[PDB]
Amino acid sequence: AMTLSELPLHTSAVVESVQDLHANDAIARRLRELGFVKGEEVRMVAKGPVGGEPLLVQVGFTRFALRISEAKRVVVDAASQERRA
Amino acid sequence: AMTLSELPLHTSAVVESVQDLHANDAIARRLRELGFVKGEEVRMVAKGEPLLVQVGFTRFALRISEAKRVVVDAASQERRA
Ligand SMILES: [Cl-]
Ligand SMILES: [Cl-]
Ligand SMILES: [Cl-]
Ligand SMILES: [Cl-]
Ligand SMILES: [Cl-]
Ligand SMILES: [Zn+2]
Ligand SMILES: [Zn+2]
Ligand SMILES: [Zn+2]
Ligand SMILES: [Zn+2]
């Protein structure tokens, strides 16, 4: 499945779910609590793919800095991708 | 391959290497610089998160994704007090 860690710059996508990386995943839990839920749009604002980290992503009107390991928990719908040019 | 994230509580093991999770892995580079090198002994002192691991006289509080990068020798495991 495509994850947020692979979302190209200036591109939005619809969140499908947030998958635990391991048992009792506090990071995954925190992401869900912050708005990363099925049906909501998330966009890659800066850094990543390429460039490096952190990945600056936006949900609603709030921006978060995520390591690739953190963004990889968020599964997005690849066919919902749209370039915000 | 056995990783530090799998080292049981109060058990020690010898580091084999540090594996990148992705290309251009800065965290992996930091671990290598921190002393997680081939031949060094690492001990799981607190949990089995956070995973508190000790190298020498330094205690590192690692998350599982960070510890999973550190590969250890399975035959080198030792139960400690
Ligand atoms: Cl976590
Ligand atoms: Cl990462
Ligand atoms: Cl990194
Ligand atoms: Cl983790
Ligand atoms: Cl990480
Ligand atoms: Zn993929
Ligand atoms: Zn990274
Ligand atoms: Zn740090
Ligand atoms: Zn974790």
Side-chain angles (χ1 to χ4, degrees):
Chain A
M2 196 185 150
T3 64
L4 179 57
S5 62
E6 320 174 83
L7 190 58
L9 292 175
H10 309 305
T11 306
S12 68
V14 174
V15 174
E16 282 192 46
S17 68
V18 177
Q19 292 299 310
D20 291 340
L21 183 73
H22 59 67
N24 208 308
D25 190 335
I27 294 177
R29 183 170 65 243
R30 297 164 187 169
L31 292 173
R32 300 189 190 92
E33 273 186 328
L34 293 173
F36 287 89
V37 293
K38 182 180 176 178
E40 298 312 295
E41 183 170 295
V42 61
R43 72 172 310 189
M44 182 64 70
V45 182
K47 167 138 263 172
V50 193
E53 296 164 273
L55 303 173
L56 189 62
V57 314
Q58 184 176 306
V59 287
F61 288 119
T62 304
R63 300 180 177 181
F64 299 115
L66 307 177
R67 295 181 174 179
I68 289 176
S69 69
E70 302 168 322
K72 194 159 297 179
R73 290 174 163 77
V74 182
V75 184
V76 301
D77 178 358
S80 70
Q81 287 178 280
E82 175 172 43
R83 181 140 168 293
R84 325 304 302 203
Chain B
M2 190 182 286
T3 63
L4 181 58
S5 66
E6 302 173 297
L7 188 56
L9 179 53
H10 299 305
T11 296
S12 62
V14 177
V15 176
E16 168 174 337
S17 71
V18 177
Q19 50 166 37
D20 289 350
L21 174 285
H22 61 76
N24 216 174
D25 189 339
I27 296 176
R29 292 196 287 275
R30 280 334 336 202
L31 290 172
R32 302 199 187 89
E33 276 188 31
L34 286 175
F36 289 99
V37 304
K38 184 186 184 186
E40 180 62 84
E41 173 181 299
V42 61
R43 309 153 50 204
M44 186 63 251
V45 178
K47 280 70 182 308
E49 279 168 331
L51 302 181
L52 190 63
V53 301
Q54 191 167 328
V55 178
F57 295 124
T58 310
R59 293 189 163 202
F60 297 102
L62 309 174
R63 73 178 59 179
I64 288 171
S65 61
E66 299 173 324
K68 200 162 73 174
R69 290 180 165 80
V70 183
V71 177
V72 295
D73 193 7
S76 72
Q77 293 177 284
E78 295 179 355
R79 287 286 295 278
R80 304 285 194 171

